[PDB]
Design a protein around this nucleic acid. Structure first.
Lengths: 140, 139, 140, 140
DNA sequence: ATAACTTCGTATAGCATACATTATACGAACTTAT
DNA sequence: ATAAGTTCGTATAATGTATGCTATACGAAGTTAT
DNA sequence: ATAACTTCGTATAGCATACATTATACGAACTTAT
DNA sequence: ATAAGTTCGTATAATGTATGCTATACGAAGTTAT
C-alpha cells in the first residue's frame, strides 16, 4: 500500500519517531541501531507495513535507500505480535551498511548480537556486492 | 499513525470543529475549554490519536505540546459517545494550562470529581518532575 | 474525519462522479437533483460523508453551501447510502434549496410531497435559515 | 473511494511498481501487457477498485486512458493463493488499443483466444469513439 | 401566605435489510370522433 | 369496431461478491536410413 | 549402421489459541595491604 | 585470610469467545415582607 514515504522530521524519541508533510504528521518507529543517526532532514526514506484491525494502526520503519530485505527476512508473521515487528530486527551489526557488511557473510545472519536466526542464501546472493559503493559514512 | 496536524480554524461547533488544510477537510473533536481559547486567531496544534470505533472515524485535538496521552486516563471498553470519547474537560480540576493537573504531585486529579476513578499510583508519574516552563499566562 | 472536500471534477456519471484533489481521485455520489445540473466549473465546494458496507466503499459528496443537514436528517445506523439519503429526493427536485427555503422554511419542510421524511425533518427548520446565501442559480 | 490515481513513477518490478509523488508511496500492480515494458512517464494515471484486505496490502492499476472496464470484465474470485486476479490475466493480447482491437467494436472482444465467446454488447459502447487514432506505440 | 429572589438537585438519545438492485416501456379497458 | 390517445400496474435481465494449485526443465516419440 | 540430426514439456510443505522468552543491572567470583 | 569487585547469569512488551443500552433544563427547598 505504502512504500518510501518521505515527510519531514526534526524530532527523536526513545521508542518513537514521526514524519510530517505540513498538514498531516505520520508516526513511524524505525529499528533501534540507526536511530542514533539519520534524524534531521527533508526525507528519511522509510518503507512501511501496517496492521488493519483492532486499534493497532501504526506505520513501521526501516532505513533509507532500500532495506525491505530485512523485513522480508525477519517477518515472523506467525503470531509474534506488534511488540516485535516494529523494532526488534537488527540480528546483524550493520552500522553504516558499508563498513561491517559483505565481510564474507559473517556479519550476514551468521554471528552478531542476535539469536542465530539460522537463515541465509537469499539476501547474500541478492546482495551482488552492492554494499561498498558510496556508503562509507552516514547522515545527520 | 497520524499525529501533530497544524493549521488554522474558521468554524466552532459544540461537538467539535474542522481543520483547514489542503485536500480533505479534517474533523477534530477537542476538549471544551481548549476550543474556546483556540479561535481563528490561535494556531491549532492538534496532537491526534484517532480513536476509531466503526462510525466514529474522526481525529481529535489537544492543547499544543501539552495534555497529550489523556487516553491513559480515558481507556475504556467501548466509548458510547463523544461525551465520553475525549470530549471531557468539563470535570477534572485544572484549567487553562492543566497546571493543577500535577502541581508537583501536591494534589491528585482522581478525588476532585465524582466522574473519575482511583488512579493515584499512575497520576504522579508525569513530565512535571522536569519542571516544564509552562506557567500562568494567556495560553 | 473528512467533511469538506475540495478538488478537481470534470466527469458526470449516472451513478455519480469523481473528485481529484491531487495524488488520488475520490469517488463521490451526489444526490439526484444536484448532479443532474451542477457538474463542473471550478473546484466545487462539495461536502462529504463516508459510509461502511460489506460490498462497497465510496464518498457521497452532498451539495455545497452546507447542505449536509440533508444527510444528517436522513441517515440511520442501518441505512445504506445508495438506498438511503440518496434515493429519497426523487419525485421532489427543488431546483435551489435557498430559493425553496427563503421565507418558506415551514412550507417546504411541512406541506411538500411525501409523508415519511417530515417526522425527522421537522428539526431542519432552524438549520439553514441563518444568513441569506448566494444560491440564485446553478453551475455548469 | 479512490479512482484514477496519479503521481511519480520511476521503478519497474516483476510484481508491479510504486507511486509516491505526494505523501505516501502507493504500490501499483499494472496488468501484464502494460507491466511488460510500459514504465517511467512524467506521471502515470491508473484506475482501481481499492480491493484492499488484511492479507493483501496492494492496490492495482490499468492503462492511462480509461480501461477500468477492463477490471470490471476481469473481476475474478481472489483466493488465498497468490498470482490470481491481482490485475493480471489479461486475456486480450493487444500491444495497444488502436494496434490490436480496432476494425470495429466487436473484434476487440470476439474470438480472441481460449474460450472464444463474444462479449461485445457489454464493452463496445465505451472506447469506440476514443481508441483511434492515437495510442499506436508504447510510452518509454 | 406569598413574590421574589437564593440555593440545592438534576441536567439529551430513537430504528432490526435476521441473503446485499423499491423498477421504465408495455396491454386491458375506456372515451371521442370518426 | 376500430383509429388514436391515456394510465397503471404491470413491474430489471443474467448483474457480481467472501480460508490453500501455478509459474518452471526433462524424457521422449519419432527423423532419417537400411 | 552406429551414431547423429527435430520436438520436446513441470519434481517449493505445514494448515488447529490468536496470552511463557527476551535489553538490561545487581551479584558471587577474582587481585592484594595480615 | 579477605573483602570486595569482574564478568558472566538476570530480566519486560495482550484480553481476541465479541457485541445492544448515563443522558445538561428546570424540579424542588428556604427567607422576607409581602
Amino acid at each position: 500500500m505504502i512504500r518510501y514515504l518521505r515527510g519531514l522530521v526534526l524530532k527523536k524519541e526513545a521508542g518513537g519517531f514521526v514524519l510530517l508533510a505540513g498538514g498531516v504528521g505520520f508516526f513511524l518507529q524505525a529499528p533501534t541501531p540507526f536511530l542514533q543517526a539519520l534524524e534531521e532532514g527533508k526525507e528519511v526514506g522509510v518503507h512501511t507495513h501496517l496492521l488493519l484491525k483492532e486499534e493497532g494502526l501504526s506505520l513501521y520503519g526501516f532505513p533509507d535507500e532500500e532495506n525491505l530485505a530485512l523485513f522480508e527476512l525477519l517477518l515472523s508473521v506467525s503470531g509474534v505480535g506488534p511488540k516485535v515487528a516494529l523494532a526488534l530486527l537488527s540480528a546483524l551489526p550493520p552500522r553504516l551498511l558499508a563498513r561491517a557488511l559483505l565481510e564474507g557473510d559473517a556479519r550476514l545472519l551468521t554471528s552478531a548480537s542476535g539469536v542465530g536466526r539460522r537463515l541465509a542464501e537469499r539476501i547474500a546472493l541478492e546482495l551482488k556486492g552492492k554494499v561498498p559503493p558510496h556508503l562509507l559514512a552516514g547522515e545527520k
